[PDB]
Symmetry: D2
Subunit: 405 residues, 4 copies
């Protein structure tokens, strides 16, 4: 009926309001994430066919929104405008839990359904998909809430039907909103790239074990009987990894060989580098209690760590990477790679199927979403300021929207 | 009966001589490959259990022997001595065709059998193999004739039984000896790494198409209905690739972006680099006749070419590499790798199964071993001098031993 | 513009007529296929979104239409009516070549495009598909032209976009229309069920080698270097299989153990049965020239042949079956199946991807569609009468519609 | 030193006695398992190369020994004699836990090592294995203790090195001896046949859930997040399945359609049969709480149950079977199999790798071996008499040999 509802409120189920509250970034306030976000009123986008409107109960936090709020080196608002967009703002957020509130044509999902979203859109009619491509790898794939405007930091969100998954009942709205992009991504890294998937007895090296990705990965690895070794930068983060089921941890502050690889011709430099990697390898042996290499290395740290990751992975093993926190130069020593027949695999979010499987595991209580802290809607900036300053807590964080839980 | 037979001759079938002619490298004559090899008399190693003695009819040529003959940067003779070896020489060669002449205990292979060898040894009792590892990827794997002494540049060779494959009848001894390490390696690159194996309609980028690896790869790709695009450095090498079934070719001399990747932070440098890679990508489009990316990139060229290879491979595609001709720094732009979910796969020689399958294809006449030139036994040095000076002909080369064909 | 065009004619490109000529079955004339089909005028169905209208140039022939024309044991017209259909007729045909003539909304395919169709429809929005199911295996899958009315025996046909594949240029309209369901189905059987796909050196047993399925299968197997052994019921059909690249053939008339398996408790009966299967196995050895079992058995013959097929398949081999010509009781001796760890795989038509790959192979001239005979539009009945009476020629047959080639 | 040691005793570690106590079957006492076994003194077989002598601490029980003790329909003693064996007795047992006591040449395993054995032997030099065959599927594979004499019902046992796996520390000798053939076999059924392996959210139908196979399977399925539905013949067996993590159970006594399939031509019979299978399918829906089919059906029951299993499995699902308790006629309705593209997979024991993985899961406490009852060495007959009379308890049973735990 009405055009605008305050946070926590909604029109009659099955109907959409004309407007809504959402947290916007604008070019004029690019900068500190704490200054970048402001709550405004905006029009609610239309609910086209195959789509549904979700009453957003809580939204997750991530790195993407930090870079969006900075503007550098990519003005996402300006980028979209150069692609035909008329918005002079950006609504971020690429995780949510909520309630289907209205649906478009062709949709089978009924108003009232409780859902968690995988923030990936693709064209279900795309030729590569129709010929057997995994949609998240399709040419038409893009991250909702980051590459596309009108993400989850909004009272309502329009999504495609295939993007929805059943909210695990036992979870709070906040916890149900914090895990999907992080957990699903880790799940794909570990179980999505046959034949290099974690098996019982497999040692796994997990960079940033106390982080969002790593928190889920440690659990996933221990769950199927693998042996998780975590990399941390503090004793407390180490203990947290032990809480999650880690065999043990390695403190990266012990080493100084991190970074780009020298010219493989620079013999002196390489030997010096090798000493660093071997020392790291020793620690790994000491944590594991045996002289084995990780069959799989979970990467995302990128430039500083990739050369070590390549060295560490077992013969016929895999380094699988979904990001580049410390930079995008992945320097590979090809001798390690080809002679031992190792795999460096790029990975990015997850498939619908994988989103569903990890949701089931969490629903059943096998995996914990690791909700570390919940923020209010006016604290979206604060929360992203934490990440930016690398002051965020271990695990995953969330933001209440229409919910009180 | 007798202790020594001249080249072309042999004791009674089923028996081993005490000595033999072979082509040796010695530390005192490390250097120019043409000076490095000399024919000498040496003791014939014992034929232990599981092993067989082969009367060597012809032996193949490769890069390994060139580096062995140079001594730098790895004194293979000194290396082996530090591992307990008593030889003060090195007999190279990692390809042969020949006749089983005597067999050890447990061997089912009968004297008289005509064989081609895959020059890879491993421990059939190794725990990783017994637990399902692919033997060529095992911790106990090593290249016979390069990492191990007493290779194929000898009148007789002792090999393990599992190393033998039926010589294709229709082939000369020279042709049957030239293909295995090269063809089998290319076959594994293209068909050994599911799910990234060449399918009908798949475009494939093949570096060094006119070389040994590339010659086989072009044929293999066209055979299963794929679309081979070759990279060459001359018009004549381009035409040769067309002879083999290539859609077309790209001349690498057209470009100057080759080499290590700049810091991904060096924006100017990267854009300049990207211009180079995009120009290369244009040529590829023009050869293919359509705007598609290679699903698989066959690599081996290494440092100069890997960044381009990474850029070129399709979403969810694979770059598979078995060497580093131009250097061992494989610089990866992680954004290309993770966002498009690409695979960089190390590959090294082949499995027994793969050696057999490519042998069958050649036996049936589907694939040509591309024997380019045959040398006499005293020309082993000359032939390796050619490779060293990059003056060798397209395709694969061989050396007569006991044979006249 | 106009409402009706005679065969061979069409409205302006991009437009649809209101009516068309098509060949109908009606309940009142169920029976002999030669009496069952009659050419009538009918309304042209609407071209909804995602769909396109095709000017049908030629249509393929198959078993399905024979059973449709008989009415027994399934009145397809009555069946559909019980599912809400208002038609009192049935237009069959599940293969066509033709020209896109008009398109619905969301379609990227342009009028003028020449296409071959895979006669399988599914719901691209189905949850099982979205969660990673192969669409042809989906709960919403069905054969266009058989389970659905308005198949290809019509001047125009409405299809879904994903159903279209590029017509191979070098083919006549008749040849381009005859192969898809048959070739694609065989292709899936042989290459669609990893890890049991044909590899170089693999012997393959192919029932009905001179038929449509078998004609393509023999070629596909020989193409990747496998060894095709064909089963036929006549010397001439044997020679035809030799034409296609078969190693040799087996004459099934030599044996009398065909049919359902006796109770495995009936020792006498089973030994008698085993004698039959062993004799068949001997012939297979004699054709192959060695004592090996087929790694893959291409089935479709069904009840009479399945017990033999199960016995014949190699340890860890596969029997893959897409039909039951002689009946639907597939009697398995579980001892053969479990002790040798064999796979009995059901298979049905093909995926879009597989339709495309086999089309590419045919386009490139690696595979011949084996067009055996072409009929005129008024001979649809005659052609199906042949199949019914088992008097049809080897290979695949087609029917001209708007075309003269 | 000495030639014979009483049960519980042994020569100096590293040495073998000339004789030993073992439980023998002899032809003269074929019949009731309780009469068939008698403890005698026998020579200890030699410890050839690659082999090790194990001081047997406990041995597992199974079906095989029951059929061995009956003699019908296969005189295993006479069979072996016709293959050249000189023994006039048979020592059964195909599971053990124990201590490596002496080793042959080439063995790396050291005296003192605690081991569990996978009772499968194969020729590590076999050509099919060397060309990539899974050894348990090899032509040279056979079950130690059943197809071969001198199994585990003996004070000492000679095994091949590859057959040994680390005993899980936390287990009693009895528990460590009872699980391997049963657990490993179930593990292969569920995780060994890609792409049909249990995934999170997968419903799985498990015949005989309270038995040895089923006990492990229920746990394995629930462990990876699947949904186990058990088939039992009593309320108490149902509750036991609930103990193991089952969603629920089905009572097979409710149905009477069990057995061989009628002729698919016998319409009346088939409809009657279908009513039975649909009723079974209803119960499955009611247990699951939703209208889904099992993605995987764990079979072994055989003739009575296979037709139902085939009907039940999901589109593109798998029925995997490792036995035929109720008979060896696996009657398949091919229409269900091909139209829904289902897989009927034979499976038999396990690979070394799989034995190791399930051992790791049990070692870590994720899976319980379900030791139901332990017998003394003179009760081997009694225990097998139970199985024979179908009076054995749920789970797995074991027999003490040299151990008191
Ligand atoms: N779909 C996708 O592509 C996807 C999905 C999720 C995440 N990601 C990416 O993956 C990365 C991690 O995400 P996240 O959510 O886990 O972030 P997070 O919660 O902050 O965890 C990242 C962890 O990385 C470790 N780290 C930071 N700098 C490092 C260095 N120089 N060397 C080694 N380790 C270092 C830190 O732990 P310690 O200080 O304890 O070592 C940090 O906690 C981000 O770059 C993110 O953008 C991508
Ligand atoms: N088991 C194994 O690991 C294995 C097996 C076989 C080969 N390999 C390795 O693979 C590499 C190629 O072997 P091959 O036998 O094919 O040697 P080859 O016959 O000499 O072919 C190599 C080709 O690489 C191309 N190339 C050279 N420099 C290049 C550059 N800077 N950029 C781009 N392309 C360049 C050349 O062709 P154009 O000048 O026409 O471009 C050359 O013909 C060698 O490094 C070898 O050691 C490894
Ligand atoms: N998508 C699908 O599910 C799909 C697709 C294509 C075909 N199919 C089915 O596959 C079957 C074959 O199709 P098709 O197009 O190849 O038909 P086809 O051209 O008639 O070939 C079938 C061949 O089967 C052989 N055959 C007949 N009776 C036999 C018996 N009692 N024992 C052994 N062999 C016998 C015959 O050859 P000989 O007399 O020379 O032995 C006959 O030529 C049909 O039942 C069809 O419905 C299914
Ligand atoms: N490597 C191998 O090939 C391998 C390994 C292990 C087992 N097996 C075979 O698998 C089968 C089961 O072994 P197991 O150790 O689990 O034996 P088990 O412990 O006795 O369990 C078998 C269960 O099957 C069920 N069953 C019996 N008759 C049935 C019928 N007519 N219909 C449906 N279900 C029935 C029974 O449970 P309810 O009465 O509660 O239904 C019984 O408890 C045996 O035939 C065995 O030889 C083979």
């Amino acid at each position: 009926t009405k055009d605008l509802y305050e946070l926590g409120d909604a029109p009659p189920l099955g109907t959409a309001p004309k407007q809504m509250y959402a947290s916007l970034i604008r070019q004029e306030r690019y900068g500190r994430p704490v200054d970048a976000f402001r709550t405004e009123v905006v029009d609610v986008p239309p609910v086209g066919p195959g789509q549904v409107l979700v009453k957003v109960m809580a939204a997750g936090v991530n790195y993407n929104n930090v870079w969006a709020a900075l503007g550098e080196p990519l003005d996402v608002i300006a980028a979209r405008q150069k692609q035909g967009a008329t918005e002079d703002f950006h609504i971020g957020g690429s995780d949510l839990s909520g309630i289907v509130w209205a649906v478009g044509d062709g949709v089978r999902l009924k108003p009232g359904a409780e859902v968690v979203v995988l923030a990936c859109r693709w064209d279900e009619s795309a030729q590569d998909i129709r010929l057997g491509a995994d949609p998240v790898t399709s040419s038409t794939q893009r991250v909702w809430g980051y590459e596309e405007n009108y993400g989850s930091f909004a009272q309502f969100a329009v999504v495609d039907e295939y993007m929805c998954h059943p909210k695990p009942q036992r979870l709070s709205w906040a916890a149900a909103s914090c895990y999907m992009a992080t957990a699903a991504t880790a799940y794909r890294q570990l179980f999505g790239w046959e034949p290099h998937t974690v098996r019982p007895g497999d040692p796994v090296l997990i960079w940033g074990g106390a982080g969002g990705l790593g928190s889920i990965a440690i659990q996933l690895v221990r769950h199927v009987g693998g042996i998780p070794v975590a990399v941390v930068s503090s004793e407390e983060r180490g203990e947290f990894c032990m809480r999650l089921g880690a065999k043990g941890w390695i403190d990266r502050r012990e080493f100084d060989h991190w970074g780009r690889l020298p010219d493989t011709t620079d013999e002196e430099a390489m030997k010096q580098w090798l000493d660093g990697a071997r020392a790291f390898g020793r620690r790994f042996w000491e944590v594991l209690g045996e002289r084995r290499a990780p069959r799989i290395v979970l990467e995302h740290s990128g430039a500083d760590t990739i050369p070590t990751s390549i060295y560490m992975a077992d013969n016929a093993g895999m380094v699988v990477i979904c990001g580049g926190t410390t930079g995008y130069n992945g320097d590979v020593d090809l001798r390690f790679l080809w002679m031992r027949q190792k795999r460096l695999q790029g990975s990015h979010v997850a498939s619908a199927r994988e989103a569903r499987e990890i949701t089931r595991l969490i629903d059943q209580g096998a995996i914990d979403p690791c909700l570390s802290r919940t923020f209010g809607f006016e604290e979206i900036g604060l929360a992203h300021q934490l990440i930016h300053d690398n002051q965020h807590p271990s695990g995953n964080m969330a933001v209440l929207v229409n919910a009180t839980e």
